[PDB]
C-alpha cells in the first residue's frame, strides 16, 4: 500500500517577520536501508510549478534562503521558517522518496497572511432582464473583502433553504489588504424563478455578531 | 543546470489519449529518472511514473493499466501517454527530474524531484468552443458583469478599457454541470458617482473571437 503523508495544519495564518512551522507525518518509517531518510519539502505559488526547498529532511537546496530549515526523523517531520516574508505565502507539500512505486506527497499546507477580523460587505444581484428572456435566472451574492476566509452563505427562496443549486468562487488573498472576496451564484430556470417572490442571501461570518441578510423581491425594485 | 521543455495538447475529450512530451537541455540525459506528476484541480500531487535513458520504468500501480511512458535518447526526450481519459484525469501535468537511477548515486547525489517543467493544464470534457454571454450586475455601491456559459478557459475582463482597476474583483471560473464555465467580475464604486460615471466591462474570449463591451448601469 501507498505511504500516507499527512500534513498539518491545513491552513496556517502567518505574521511577517515571525516564525512559522508546518508538520508532515508518514504512515511508516522513511528511513531507507541505505541509511538516508528521503523526505522533501516543496513550495508552490499559484500559476507556478512546485519548487523543492529541502531534501533528505534537512539539506537545503541551492539558492534557497536560509530562513527555511527542515528537521525531524522516522515518521515525524517539520519545516520551519524563522522569519516569514511576504513571498513565503502559498502551498507547501512534503514528499517521501523511500518507498516506491509510487512516490507520494502530502495534501498541502496553505500559508496565508494573518490580519484582524473584517466583516464582509454583502450585496445581492437579481438576474438581468436580458438573461431572463433566454430562459435562465442567475442570482448572485457578493461578499466583499472579508477575513478570515471561512464564511457561510445560505440561499433562501421565500424562506425555503436552498441546496444543490448554487456554486461559490473565492479570490486569492489580496496582496494589499489581505482580505478575501466571495461570490455565490444561485441558478434557477426562468419557470422556477417566477414561482417565488423573496430571494435572499444569508451570510454567516466571524466578523458579524449575527448573520447578515440581503434580499430582493422579484418584479419589484 | 537541467532545463525541461514541455509540450502537448491539454484540451481533450473523454476516452481519448493524453499525450505529453518533454525535452532535456543543459546536462546529461543519463544518471537519473525522468518522471511525470499531476495535480488535480484544487488538490495535491500524484506521481504517475518514470523512465530512464535505458528505458527502465516504474509506474504508479493505480494507473499502470492506462499509462505508457517512453523515451527517445537520440533527441534527449521522453513522453507520457494516458489512455481512456475521463474527468478524473483532469489536472496540471508536470514532467520532472527524479532520483538517481543507481544505488550509490541515489545515496549521495542531491537529485530527487528537484527540477520541474512548466505545467500543462489538462481538461477532459465533451464541450465544444463557445463564447460567453455577458450580463450586467446592476448597482459604496457594487456592480459587475456575469460572464456565463463559455468554453474553454480563459476569458479576460477589464473595466473601462483598463482605466478602472481599483476595487475590482474578478472571480475564478466555476465549471458548471453543463460542462461550461461561468464567472463574475465585480467592482465597488462610490454611490455618489453612479449617475455621472460610466462603467463598462470589456470581455475577451480568444478561442471564439468574442469581444464584448457591456455597460452596467442602475435599473429603472
Author numbering:
A (entry chain L): 0 to 220
B (entry chain H): 1 to 139, 148 to 228
Give the published text:
Signalling initiated by antigen binding to B-cell receptor (BcR) immunoglobulins (IGs) is of paramount importance throughout the natural history of the disease. Recently, a cell-autonomous model of CLL cell activation was demonstrated whereby BcR IGs from both stereotyped and non-stereotyped CLL cases could promote Ca2+ influx and nuclear factor-κB target gene transcription without the addition of exogenous antigen. We demonstrate that BcR IGs derived from both indolent and aggressive CLL cases interact homotypically via their combining sites, binding to distinct internal epitopes in each subset of patients. These unexpected BcR–BcR interactions are sufficient to initiate intracellular Ca2+ influx, and mediate stronger affinities and long half-lives for the receptors derived from anergic B cells from indolent clinical cases, while weaker and short-lived for the aggressive ones.
